Ligand binder design. Sequence first.
Ligand SMILES: Nc1ncnc2c1ncn2[C@@H]1O[C@H](CSCC[C@H](N)C(=O)O)[C@@H](O)[C@H]1O
Ligand SMILES: COC1=CC=C(C(N)=O)CN1C
Length: 256
Amino acid sequence: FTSKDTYLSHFNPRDYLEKYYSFGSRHCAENEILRHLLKNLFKIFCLGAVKGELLIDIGSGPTIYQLLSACESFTEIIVSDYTDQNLWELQKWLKKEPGAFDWSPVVTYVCDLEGNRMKGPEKEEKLRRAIKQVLKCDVTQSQPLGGVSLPPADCLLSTLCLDAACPDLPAYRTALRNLGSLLKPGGFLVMVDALKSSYYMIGEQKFSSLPLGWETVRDAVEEAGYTIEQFEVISQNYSSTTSNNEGLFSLVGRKP
Ligand SMILES: Nc1ncnc2c1ncn2[C@@H]1O[C@H](CSCC[C@H](N)C(=O)O)[C@@H](O)[C@H]1O
Ligand SMILES: COC1=CC=C(C(N)=O)CN1C
């Protein structure tokens, strides 16, 4: 199983973004998954009771797509990742640097989803404004943010991270417990991840995944104490040879 060290030495943020999040003419399977992810996140953050002051995103990588609807419902956002170069790629975009990844097509799509009450540049400004901190994190640690003093979060978000970070089910359960240390009683856990995937690719670079069915995900989350408020299966697959996933899931849990 892919180690933490392999992420540091092999994960190329710009390549990752180009292959999965360009929302262009190529990578059509990847485009379809992204549309569905954005639809589910819109419903989770804009149509429900998932709102509050502070949201902490765990394992953000170099991406912001998972935060676009969230910033309508949360005033403060903290993003975090294990991999230093991912955080720097994120910063390129936050600081509006030349050469930052083009998120426009994604931003436009979310604006469309939210009824066009807002144009692209306004949405991008609002997200930049909401993101308060960009921090190192390690989900495998009892104190995932290195024990920095932060208020307990109203929402804990993690997309496409836990399957990649956990070599087996005991490790997956431990990571779930670890994340809970950051969340208020009554707070929301929002999770997205691949189903039944044992790997994903960034070009030639292969990264491990823990293959889990939706029932197994449900049980692990429920055994961690969460009341599952929402759970959806996304029945789309990544491109052949890109992953062996059979769909993805999204879920909303509430901490007792
Ligand atoms: N032990 C760990 N703790 C926190 N993050 C980890 C981790 N091991 C791997 N990761 C991160 O998990 C991410 C998987 S790529 C997922 C990126 C983004 N959240 C998206 O939805 O596309 C990588 O950015 C990697 O750095
Ligand atoms: C697009 O990024 C990803 C795709 C599939 C993954 C998996 N666990 O199969 C993980 N992952 C980060």
